[PDB]
Ligand binder design. Structure first.
Ligand code: MN
Ligand code: MN
Ligand code: MN
Ligand code: MN
Ligand code: MN
Length: 90
């Protein structure tokens, strides 16, 4: 994993949000979290081959802090429909 992505993961807040891994400007995986810190730190010790691939292929990580868990649910669904990222199921 790129050093800049590891740093961004370790700085993420204990707040609800949506996250987007990208390569060359294109989303490759979109997810949501009750706490961005907890879900993003799980990418550091990969429990599945899919989690390993997402963290190695990415050259960028974007995070979006939201108002609450209801906003996280609908924003994540809308962005998956818009971008159809390679590692999200269809
Ligand atoms: Mn590494
Ligand atoms: Mn999801
Ligand atoms: Mn496996
Ligand atoms: Mn980055
Ligand atoms: Mn960007």
């Amino acid at each position: 994993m790129k050093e800049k992505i590891r740093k961004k993961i370790l700085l993420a807040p204990e707040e609800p949000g949506v996250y987007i891994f990208k390569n060359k400007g294109v989303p490759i995986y979109i997810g949501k979290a009750k706490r961005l810190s907890n879900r993003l730190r799980s990418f550091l010790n990969p429990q599945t081959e899919k989690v390993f691939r997402i963290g190695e292929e990415a050259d960028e990580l974007e995070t979006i802090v939201v108002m609450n868990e209801r906003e996280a649910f609908i924003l994540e669904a809308n962005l998956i429909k818009k971008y159809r990222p390679k590692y999200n199921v269809r």
